[PDB]
């Protein structure tokens, strides 16, 4: 039969059957009875204020509190009269009907009703049903008081009292005697409950978006009749007796900003559900499991031993034995002897522990609840009337589809309903506050902070170290890993407990001994003063807030001034924003000023890709340090620089000390002489090692989740608060500016505040989205980088020791006992090689962590191993792992990451790596990318060109590795194989073809090998490929040393720019992006790729013609174009074109010619390109009003016209990187429109000597298409390459 609610009023006469006057167990024998109603059998409601342990004066509000976590509300005038008691009882009936509606409520019930507590705790022999114990029975009055008093015994399972002296507090107390509890040792007892239906908690969410664009009423409130099932699941645990006590999670209190909280056991963590039960280590899980199993076996022994009761003759035997067997799910043998089935007990334990939880109940009932135990909270709000059927419907609840609210959880939104659910005045709320004040005796600055805002950091005393126990293993031992996931189909298969037997009656004899212990509660002070000077969130969020009674303010960027003056506020935005906000305008431009300041606020709050630079950083929020200052004072300096040089470890202000004990070795002393069972022991040892790997990973994950995410969530909450405060301050300032003036401007220009409020809220929402994404990525990066390697090191050492021990054992015993051994030698040599990969999907289930972990792992810029970059005249790895580099300050290098390597031993770079990261078993898969410049041959050393072999990059550690060699016109990549053979990759440049653009030029090279193929990229394309299909099984273990390692001529020096080695697959669509990112630059390029320089000798080169230059004759000053020649010296071995030809285009200025001062780079600079010929000065001239066609520029004598603007402009006209420039001679400065397009014209120049047929490159309207469609300009007369002279190139 389904559970049935009995409906009746409060003034009904005492029937002594359904409305009795019992005595609560904690009342002992005082003699003050209480009326009590029953809803369902063994579920007694008793409406009255809980007064067992509290003083009568305790109820009124005082300066004290009870517990240091929750915020409390006092009220003495609750449940005063019969009307209030009747309303309480009606609300209880309504809530129970709401619970009974859904099938899951019926499953939760019918389980705390049919579960009868065992008769008698351990202080009784194994053959007695000692009914006279305070944890079983209570006494009820039969006769009307005054002449005759009788007491009869009545059973119970749950007694629901009223609220305590604090309405918010709800608890489920149990019964225990002489400091020993029968509710934990598999027995169970009657339990009480405290409750109040009206008041409910108010929570909030961050990731999601609120329905309304307002923060006056924000968040949600918890639905009544769902707080109740939390207490009922606690009651079910206590009643079934599995409320085992074990290691708590103590909050650390060794610092001045730590949270103070009472210890919390696993009972409060196993029922809240979600990701919280994952901070409970599997060792503690198995310990609890074993304790529960042992207790149940003990009760099996007691139940099989008991045979007669000597207290109440009315009690039967066989029916009670059958009922207890049904309750505990035992197995009855044909001889009447009970037992325990391991699978049945495991199923029961999982169903009772993981099967029911608050998150699952909320998801089933479609009710909004919090995300985790460690989360935000808000002051509570009451409900005006829970009985009015227009507000709360027992079929749906707060989400009535009639009023169009069953969507997006609209029913429980505080802002949208806003009318039927009053708030609670803060004139009676008492909270635990901490007063943080400066070291000075009287600073005038003493800040208050709630205890609910500080950082919660766990302590290392709360994590067990069962890994270090010496383990004995034999062929009969298999260890089962207990899961932490509940399939909801268990209850479906159970199907409403059809097989349960009807419970026996509740009429037994009365009790005699009623001695039982009762708790005593005491108040605490609510003020705690500490002296601190380390500025943090608690010191910035207060300075960002202005007093309520002030009217006019003015933002400023001085935190010291913000603390000193209450008039000003602190703003971490830009100085232009501060100036705009401080500006004062007139009535004419008020609307324009308002729009401008709102747009500026939105743009300033929306920033995600600041300082787009070649560096490998995806996203960053550049005002977190300026707004919060969390860590080692990240506010000062550059947050971007600090992040890029310190990794993700700079935000946190307390680095946890990990607990990674060394795991104990195995004791495989089974000593089986025959029956070849040693293989079973070996396999069991391997499985046990796997389980220990899993346990260590779980421990690391639990500690991470307990500390790091908590601190980062506090950071995110502070960010939300700061942004909201800034928006509110801006709106208040705008309102004051509007209100300052008289009615004239109000009538002339009209504006409403709702539009600007909505715009500001939208901006805040977008900014919070970006900040949340950044913080989540940072947290996952820290987890994957700074914690796992230590664990994998410890497990690798343990694996080595275990392999040695197993090898010694097998050699000493089994090698002689059994001939066949090579199979298990191969097993112990191969299986113990590969490590178990990490995977968060096994140790966590909720999508919030998994999705961002997957995104981080899919990201390609988070897989750097050996990020080599220049930073402060030193080489520091930017990968974040931390590698030791040995260099001195004597050497001098350019800032833009330039390395020069030669045969001299003076230049020495030593790198020691932390190659203990999760290893790559397959290997044969990586990439190496770098930028090279190589010298040129000087027609000397044919042996050097042909025979010589040299290299600068190598990895030779265990006589098998890989290296990259460079020859004269060759690129080689050699890898070694354990067998003896070697595979090599060859590439070369054509030099007899007379076409070359790589020689003495920067060139990007990438080598990428996978299991299938090894590929070479030099320009983003494939030219030469060869197969590496052979399985090499050679892994790079040692260091890589950068040196030629050969004493040769000093004339050779190799230039290197950017070394990056990836252990990740780089197949395609990433190499080209890397090329573009690392080659993109604002400045201009030389012939080879160096920055364009001033006062540098230059010569003409264009891709249109291979032989053209400008030369001025030594005898006579005439400049013109002649054809180029080859090298004058004859050399049949090799030949090349001539380069050091023509006249220089030096930028010589008489005012500043030597020691030019550092200037400021500006786009489209005004540069004059004129050269000097000894004492003759030339002038570049063009006839302003030219009427001819194809007219050359004039090299004229000196003219006294310099104030006129005949400047030359330089730019680019192609998207992809190149080595060329675009020159322009703009005669009119304000020519905002295009004067003309490109024109290549065949021209018969009117030369006196001869009519030269040239291809002149002028501004003509005959080739509009090229520079109108704007492709990548590679071939044109608009190249104008500037080729300097340097000692690297020998004439």
Residue numbers in the entry: 1 to 1291
Paper text:
Complete movies were collected on a Titan Krios microscope, resulting in EM maps at 3.6 and 3.7Å average resolution for BoNT/B and BoNT/E, respectively, although local resolution varied significantly. Here, BoNT/B also presents a linear arrangement of its three domains, whereas the BoNT/E map shows it retained its more compact domain organisation, thus alleviating reservation that this singular domain organisation among BoNTs may have been experimental artefacts. Our structures are of inactive variants of the toxins presenting dual mutations at the catalytic site (BoNT/B1 E231Q/H234Y and BoNT/E1 E213Q/H216Y). A similar set of mutations (i.e., HQxxY) in BoNT/A was previously shown to prevent binding of the catalytic Zn2+ ion, which is also not visible in either of the two maps presented here. In the cryo-EM map of BoNT/B, the belt is well-ordered except for a small surface-exposed α-helix (residues 487–495), whereas in BoNT/E, a section could not be modelled due to the lack of map for residues 499–515, which forms a random coil in the crystal structure. For BoNT/B, the lack of density in some areas, particularly the HCC subdomain, suggests that the preferred particle orientation observed in the angular distribution map is the main reason affecting map quality and resolution, although local dynamism of the domain cannot be excluded. Since HC/B has been well defined by X-ray crystallography, it was fully included in the deposited coordinates associated with the map. Although the crystal structures of BoNT/B and BoNT/E were used to produce the cryo-EM models some differences were observed when comparing the output from both methods, with direct superposition showing root mean square deviations of 1.9 Å (over 1218 paired residues) and 2.0 Å (over 1197 paired residues) for types B and E, respectively. For example, overall superposition with BoNT/B results in a nearly perfect overlap of the translocation domains, whilst the core secondary structure of LC appears shifted by approximately 1.5 Å, with some of the larger loops deviating more significantly.
